[PDB]
Each structure stands twice: as structure tokens, then as C-alpha cells.
Amino acid sequence: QETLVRPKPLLLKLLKSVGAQKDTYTMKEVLFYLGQYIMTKRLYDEKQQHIVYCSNDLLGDLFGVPSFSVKEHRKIYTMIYRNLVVVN
């Protein structure tokens, strides 16, 4: 009974670019796939892998910054919620 969400078009484009095949998700799925996006596109610092650089990327459009640490949970959840609607 986790909340279901419907990503808006930019977030959905990112999710589908890493092989998600649906239009509704749980938050934990959304997080999982954004993490995979970062990993597969190598947007992280090789030395401190918590650090992301996304200025040249649609991910930077979603989060509204050129760089962030994955420890920025307020920012990450807030920007994700701005990019979806709740279904069920």
C-alpha cells in the first residue's frame, strides 16, 4: 500500500532512459531508477561517489542545480515531488 506516483514528462523520460517500462511507480522505484541513471551515465565523482555533476544533463534540469551530493535528501525528495502527481 505504498503511495503510487505518476511522473511528469521530464522525470518519466529519465526513468524510461534506464529501462523502466511503466507510467506509475512507488517513490522507492523512482529513487532506484534515478540512482541508476546517475550510475549508468557516470555522473558521479570517482573518489567520493556521493557527489554528482549534472550541469550538462536533463538530470540538472530536474534538480535545478549543476551539482549535488546524494546526501541532499531534502532537495532530492522535494524536486522529485515537484515532478509527479500522486495517484493511489
Ligand SMILES: COc1ccc(C2=N[C@@H](c3ccc(Cl)cc3)[C@@H](c3ccc(Cl)cc3)N2C(=O)N2CCNC(=O)C2)c(OC(C)C)c1
Ligand atoms: C557512496 O556512493 C553512493 C551511496 C549511495 C547512493 C545512493 N543513495 C540513494 C539515495 C539517495 C538520496 C535519497 Cl533522497 C534516497 C536514496 C540512491 C540515490 C537515489 C536517487 C538519487 Cl537522485 C541519487 C542516489 N543511491 C543509489 O542509487 N545507489 C546506491 C549505492 N550504489 C549505487 O550504485 C546506487 C549513491 O548513489 C549514486 C547514484 C550517486 C552513491
